[PDB]
Design a protein around this ligand. Structure first.
Ligand SMILES: [Cl-]
Ligand SMILES: [Cl-]
Ligand SMILES: [Zn+2]
Length: 315
């Protein structure tokens, strides 16, 4: 006796593909790798409770390949398997509202993701892939499981791995509309003279070397090919924020002088991130945990600042 049920397959959870499945065969035998809200059902035979349900499958024909690219903006063949693997964990995480923002209760080394999510809610940023637009909208409303699983997939990180906030933000910014962001730098060597550089997009909003936006405007010392130290300073900035990053070092955050910051305690192999936000006072959001202080000092790795337009007074 042949038994069948109707199910739907998808790559984006919007466009559905009607399937009739033989209840005598695994999902794997019929569709290849198959997932039900993140759970791998490849080796499971259809249940009666499955009728009418939506299953994710890998893009295995031209229609799904186009749908997957249009939704995620990636053709990485392992992407949906990585997204589903992460989602099976992130759907069990807790997303408390802390000081009016969606955070993440600590689990599975997810401190870097909490501080990234908190930062995103404080800066002006629009994502390009519909997957991130839709998932980020849900995250802002408090249901961040899809958004967190997408960040893990886009960053090639598995649940439990040690992430870096700077690297995570770089991936998210690659998938954001930063096209009108512009930065002009001048590099002055007492031997070699002056050289101006223009940076656009993600490179216009990220700097690695100093946490202080004010120091970057005054000048920072960098190597020159001649062997001397040159001075690099900000000539012009057009962006709605900037991110200043450096290896973790004891640093004092002053209320009203920055938007938010990431603190990292530990070493190259394991550690813990916290988030500091400057509002009516300094709030330290540590997943579900919240403390406040008038002053803050700690091993800061990243600081975000509000911007619109800046032009140097240096000649
Ligand atoms: Cl689809
Ligand atoms: Cl968006
Ligand atoms: Zn030089």
């Amino acid at each position: 006796e042949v038994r069948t049920i109707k199910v739907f397959t998808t790559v984006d959870n919007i466009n559905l593909h009607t399937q009739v499945v033989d209840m005598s065969m695994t999902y794997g035998q019929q569709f290849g790798p198959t997932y039900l809200d993140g759970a791998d059902v490849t080796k499971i035979k259809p249940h009666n409770s499955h009728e009418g349900k939506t299953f994710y499958v890998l893009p295995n024909d031209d229609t799904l390949r186009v749908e997957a690219f249009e939704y995620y903006h990636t053709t990485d063949p392992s992407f949906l398997g990585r997204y589903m693997s992460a989602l099976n964990h992130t759907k069990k995480w807790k997303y408390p509202q802390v000081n009016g923002l969606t955070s993440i209760k600590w689990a599975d080394n997810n401190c870097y993701l909490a501080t990234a999510l908190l930062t995103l809610q404080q800066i002006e940023l629009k994502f390009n892939p519909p997957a991130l637009q839709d998932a980020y909208y849900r995250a802002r409303a408090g249901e961040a499981a899809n958004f967190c699983a997408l960040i893990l997939a886009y960053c090639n990180k598995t649940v439990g791995e040690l992430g870096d906030v700077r690297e995570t933000m770089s991936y998210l910014f690659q998938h954001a509309n930063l096209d009108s962001c512009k930065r002009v730098l001048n590099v002055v060597c007492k031997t070699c003279g002056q050289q101006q550089t223009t940076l656009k997009g993600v490179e216009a909003v990220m700097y690695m070397g100093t946490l202080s936006y004010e120091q970057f405007k005054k000048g920072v010392q960098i190597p020159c090919t001649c062997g001397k130290q040159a001075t690099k300073y900000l000539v012009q900035q057009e962006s709605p924020f900037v991110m200043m990053s450096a290896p973790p070092a004891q640093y004092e955050l002053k209320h009203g002088t920055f938007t938010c910051a990431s603190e990292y305690t530990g070493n190259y192999q394991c550690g813990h991130y916290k988030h500091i936000t400057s509002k009516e006072t300094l709030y330290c959001i540590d997943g579900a945990l919240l403390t406040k202080s008038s002053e803050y000092k700690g091993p800061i790795t990243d600081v975000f600042y509000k911007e619109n337009s800046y032009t140097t007074t240096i000649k």
